[PDB]
Design a protein around this ligand. Structure first.
Ligand SMILES: Nc1ncnc2c1ncn2[C@@H]1O[C@H](CSCC[C@H](N)C(=O)O)[C@@H](O)[C@H]1O
Lengths: 321, 239
RNA sequence: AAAUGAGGCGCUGCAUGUGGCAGUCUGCCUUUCUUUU
């Protein structure tokens, strides 16, 4: 019957969720065990799980599904469940028991791994990595087999398949060689290096430029207003059609508003001077943005990105001369 | 909307090849300065740089997210050197092993791949006064699959500046080779913007009229031929 | 002859509405920020 099949699925998933390996990996269900009287949790808490919502929301059928159950006991009402056997320590032989496997065909299922790997051993745990909550399998799996010889049989049975010990030593060797190459390149950069209150108030220096067209990048705008006369600031968030510039002098402002030809005829732009209390509130906005930038904590940049940046800039400058 | 794809990447060390470079003939490529446009993954670039020997070869693209990956592709052939085969997943998240080969100051060039370098920039400055300001520094210019997107994105006008700029970058005696797109499926993708469609209906030159316009003296190429999508050799004159 | 990578966390001290700079073992880590909870 399909009802019996659903009971078998519920018993299978719950006995995995009270399995030893999955409890020794997951933080959360262990905390649901530990924040309890003698290790208990409501069944409707387990109903909230994403694979459990794919099956059954009826807790009565779930309590019927754990009548034939090996490692779950229920208390009285069929609304709380125990682990039957209490949780001991985490074993260390599971590191030896594990199997790493690369090259998955982007159709990764836990059931797909059980369908290929139940034949040679009794599969206990699977780890599968998703690409940053975009729901994509990466292409490799961590399979937990039990008691060594099943896994050593399975590695002999074959989709590169290798041991976790081999994987960990391979990781150690890979990081050692990358550290050696980056040490030599840091020596190269050392050798070539050895070879070689904020802004104050001026009236009328602020030009607001409105556009009807959506504006391009601010580097082009900085080069556009800077090629005519002296820009102190180009204020533009990426995607706004209205922007500002702060200039050095009112002579700079008077020159750029008299640049009618190359500004207004090339592009439909309204280049004007803020006056009134628009200027006063804009100086307030400048001082507030200054205090916000100064109170900002520092950005993070990793070592290999900064080093690959500096290394490519020095390769560019040394190749071009 | 440039149509660029990160796929068809070459993990393979350059014996097994794409097949476009099977068509190309070896004679020009030996010890000659090469500018090459539009090569995002760099796999066709690097395979030229290994098998034949140019002195300097520079690829150029616009997308900053593609040139960073092409520099990863040059780092993979340096990370090429019980031997280990290396888990594929480990490299993906950690990045490749080796360093970028920055040369010395007392250094010897023309050794794979101390030659090649990927620079980033838009090619057309949109000003013919800036087209006139250029100087020649190359011998062999290669350009595949650029006519399509530059055509659809910059009209005829940016394409005319691109032809004039590549004639301004050739040294005399220098060779430009092209395999341009046919007119075939230009329409298939016009709605990436409205501006892309407004330039697709603004097309005032055909790909059969490409080879006429390159012989037109607004660009001014000397002699051209076709020895095999089409395969075309355009020559600036000798000296 | 048509769409995935710097993904996570820092520690410094010079500069800072100015678009960061020089270090930190490649700054460390990467199965992992992770829901088969
Ligand atoms: N104006 C321009 N300036 C610089 N590069 C441009 C450009 N217009 C287009 N390109 C580049 O030219 C490339 C052509 S797509 C061809 C890529 C190549 N066949 C490969 O396999 O990688 C585009 O990806 C785009 O990045």
């Amino acid at each position: 019957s399909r009802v019996k099949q659903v009971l078998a699925d519920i018993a299978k998933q719950v006995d995995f969720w009270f399995g030893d390996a999955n409890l020794h990996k997951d933080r959360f269900l262990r905390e649901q065990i530990e924040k309890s009287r003698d290790g208990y949790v409501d069944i409707s808490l387990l109903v909230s799980f994403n694979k459990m919502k794919k099956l059954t929301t009826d807790g009565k059928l779930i309590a019927r599904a754990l009548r034939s159950s090996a490692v779950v006991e229920l208390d009285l009402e069929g609304t709380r469940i125990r682990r039957k056997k209490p949780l001991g320590e985490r074993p260390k032989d599971e590191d030896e028991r594990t199997v790493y496997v690369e090259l998955l065909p982007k159709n990764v299922n836990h059931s797909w791994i059980e369908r290929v790997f139940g034949k040679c051993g009794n599969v206990v745990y699977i780890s599968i990595p998703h690409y940053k909550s975009t729901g994509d399998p990466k292409g490799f799996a961590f399979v937990e087999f039990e008691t060594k010889e099943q896994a050593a049989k399975a590695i002999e049975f074959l989709l590169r398949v290798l041991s976790k010990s081999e994987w960990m030593d391979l990781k150690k060797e890979y990081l050692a060689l990358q550290k050696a190459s980056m040490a030599s390149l840091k020596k190269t950069i050392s050798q070539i290096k050895s070879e070689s209150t904020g802004p104050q108030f001026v009236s009328g220096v602020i030009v607001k430029i409105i556009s009807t067209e959506p504006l391009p990048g601010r580097k082009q705008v900085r080069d556009t207003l800077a090629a005519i006369s002296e820009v102190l600031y180009v204020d533009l968030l990426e995607g706004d059609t209205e922007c500002h510039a702060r200039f050095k002098t009112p002579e700079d402002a008077q020159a750029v508003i008299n640049a009618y030809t190359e500004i207004n005829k090339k592009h439909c732009w309204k280049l004007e001077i803020l006056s009134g209390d628009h200027e006063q509130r804009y100086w307030q906005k400048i001082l507030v943005d200054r205090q916000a930038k100064l109170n900002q904590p520092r950005e993070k940049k990793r070592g290999t990105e900064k080093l690959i940046t500096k290394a490519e800039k020095i390769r560019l400058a040394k190749t071009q001369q | 909307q440039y149509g660029n794809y990160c796929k068809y990447y070459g993990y393979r060390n350059p014996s097994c090849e794409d097949g476009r470079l099977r068509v190309l003939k070896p004679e020009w490529f030996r010890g000659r300065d090469v500018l090459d446009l539009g090569c995002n993954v760099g796999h066709l670039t690097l395979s030229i740089a290994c098998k034949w020997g140019p002195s300097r070869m520079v690829g150029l693209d616009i997308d900053s997210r593609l040139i960073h990956s092409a520099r990863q592709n040059i780092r993979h052939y340096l990370s090429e050197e019980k031997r280990s085969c290396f888990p594929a997943s480990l490299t993906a998240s950690r990045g490749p092993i080796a360093a970028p080969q920055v040369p010395l100051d007392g250094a010897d060039t023309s050794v794979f791949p101390n030659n090649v370098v990927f620079v980033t920039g838009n090619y057309v400055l949109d000003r013919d006064d800036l087209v006139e300001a250029q100087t020649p520094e190359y011998d062999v210019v290669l350009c595949l699959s650029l006519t399509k997107w530059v055509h659809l994105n910059w009209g005829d006008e940016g394409l005319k500046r691109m032809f004039r700029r590549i004639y301004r970058h050739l040294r005399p005696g220098g060779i430009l080779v092209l395999e341009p797109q046919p007119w075939s499926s230009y329409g298939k993708r016009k709605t990436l913007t409205e501006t892309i469609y407004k330039n697709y209906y603004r097309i005032q030159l055909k790909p059969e009229q490409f080879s006429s316009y390159l012989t037109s003296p607004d660009v001014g190429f000397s002699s051209y031929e076709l020895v095999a999508r089409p395969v075309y050799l355009f020559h600036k004159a000798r000296s």
